[PDB]
Amino acid sequence: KAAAPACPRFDDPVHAAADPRVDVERITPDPVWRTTCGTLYRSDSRGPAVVFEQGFLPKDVIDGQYDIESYVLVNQPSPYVSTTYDHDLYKTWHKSGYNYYIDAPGGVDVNKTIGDRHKWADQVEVAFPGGIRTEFVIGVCPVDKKTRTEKMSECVGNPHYEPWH
Q1: Is 40 labelled a binding residue?
Q2: Is 45 one of the annotated binding-site residues?
Q3: Main-chain phi, psi angles of 58, to 5 degrees
Q4: Count of CB atoms situated within 10 Å of the CB of 100
Q5: Which among 141, 143, 146, 145 has a CA at the least distance from the CA of 156?
Q6: Which three-class secondary structure string do you get for the chain?
Q7: CB pairs under 8 A, 24+ apart, for 61-65?
C-alpha cells in the first residue's frame, strides 16, 4: 500500500455548513475542531431524496442551543448536525432508517471539547455547526431494523458528492 497523506486544512471552520448563518462565536465551550478527514456517519430517518437535495440542515441556527454540552445531554433544537466517527453506531439507534456516509471538513469534536467523561462519550460525536452541505454527503445505506445491519445492495451514492482530498 502506501502511508496516508495529512488532510487539507480549511481556513473557515464551518466551510461545510449548509446554513452559513451559524454564529461560530456563540459556540460554547471553546470548540476543539476536528482536523482529520476520514469518513463520518449519521443515522437519520430522513430519506436520501431529501438529504441529497438539501444536505443536512440544522434545526435552529438563530435561537437554537449553542452550548455543546447542553445539546448533547438534552438535544433541544440547535445549530448543530451530529455525526459520528463510528461506522457501526447505527446499530445502537432505534428505528432510524439510514446510515449516511459523510466526507466533510471540520466539525466540532465533541469528546475533545467537553471531555470523554460524559454520558454519551461512547457516541464519539462530531457536531457540525450550520449543518453539512450535500457536496459533503457521500451516500447512504438503508438499515434493516430487525437485524441492525446495512442493506448493502440498496446503498446509494449522492450524485452531488464532490471529492476534495
Answers
A1: no
A2: yes
A3: -80, 160
A4: 24
A5: 141
A6: CCCCCCCCCCCCCCCCCCCCCCCHHHCECCCCECCCCCCEEEEECCCHHHHHHHCECCCCCCCCCCEHHHHHHHCCCCCEEEEECCCCHHHHCCCCCEEEEECCCCCEEHHHHHCCCCCCHHHCEEEEECCECHHHEEEEEEEECCCCEECHHHCEECCCCCCCC
A7: 61/19, 61/21, 61/22, 61/23, 61/129, 61/130, 62/21
Answer yes or no: is 151 a known binding residue.
no
3-state secondary structure 3-39: CCCCCCCCCCCCCCCCCCCCCHHHCECCCCECCCCCC
What type of residue sits at position 34? R
Report the distance separating Cα 139 and Cα 85, nearest Å: 16
Elucidation technique: X-ray
Tell me which residue range forms the domain holding 76: 1-165
Q: Cell 437485524 appears where?
A: 147
Note the resolution in Å, 1 decimal.
1.8
